[PDB]
Design a protein around this ligand. Structure first.
Ligand SMILES: C[C@H](CCC(=O)O)[C@H]1CC[C@H]2[C@@H]3CC[C@@H]4C[C@H](O)CC[C@]4(C)[C@H]3C[C@H](O)[C@]12C
Ligand SMILES: C[C@H](CCC(=O)O)[C@H]1CC[C@H]2[C@@H]3CC[C@@H]4C[C@H](O)CC[C@]4(C)[C@H]3C[C@H](O)[C@]12C
Length: 159
């Protein structure tokens, strides 16, 4: 079946800029600013639209060596990004796939809020504990704060 988890994260950076830096060009920026969490991102095939497959490689010592993301949908206008984890780690073992949605919304103070939705499609009767998924939240937060710090220090980037 499916386990649905949702979380939110806030940022002081405006939505359009965060969307462009973190999501659209995250395969280039994240490995640069957060090498301790993502060693590299490889484009397997596609040019960025639906069907694009990317391989996310993790640093030595991490539990899983890599996962592959497949881009499902991209709304450059309302800042919505849908992608699926289709291979690697537990996927293919206890999970069939993970479907995620990221929506970035502007706040009146000039910042933004990232609304994250994760749907874990399990295999058989495996249970995904809400406590075990906290690891994806912390990873998410780490990457976000690293990109935010970079964007505050380089005003000319991703304008
Ligand atoms: C695979 C996990 C979590 C999956 C889940 O548990 O729901 C997610 C959590 C944060 C994700 C990263 C966010 C920043 C980047 C977004 C890019 O567009 C694709 C590469 C990066 C580096 C993403 C790679 C991968 O998609 C991660 C590391
Ligand atoms: C905890 C769940 C579910 C595990 C299960 O049901 O067996 C799994 C599913 C996908 C897993 C993530 C895959 C991407 C990353 C791999 C890294 O090497 C460790 C951190 C991350 C972010 C993993 C954290 C955690 O291991 C998750 C979120």
């Amino acid at each position: 079946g499916v386990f649905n988890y949702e979380t939110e994260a806030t940022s002081v950076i405006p939505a359009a800029r965060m969307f462009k830096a973190f999501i659209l060009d995250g395969d280039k920026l994240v490995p640069k600013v957060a090498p301790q969490a993502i060693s590299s991102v490889e484009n397997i095939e596609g040019n960025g639209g639906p069907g694009t497959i990317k391989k996310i490689n993790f640093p030595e010592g991490f539990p899983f060596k890599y996962v592959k993301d497949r881009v499902d949908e991209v709304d450059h206008t309302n800042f919505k990004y849908n992608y699926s984890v289709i291979e690697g780690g537990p996927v293919g073992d206890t999970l069939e796939k993970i479907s995620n949605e990221i929506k970035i919304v502007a706040t009146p103070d000039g910042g933004c809020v990232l609304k994250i939705s994760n749907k874990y499609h399990t295999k058989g009767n495996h249970e995904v504990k809400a406590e075990q998924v906290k690891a994806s939240k912390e990873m998410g937060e780490t990457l976000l704060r690293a990109v935010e710090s970079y964007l505050l220090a380089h005003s000319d980037a991703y304008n």
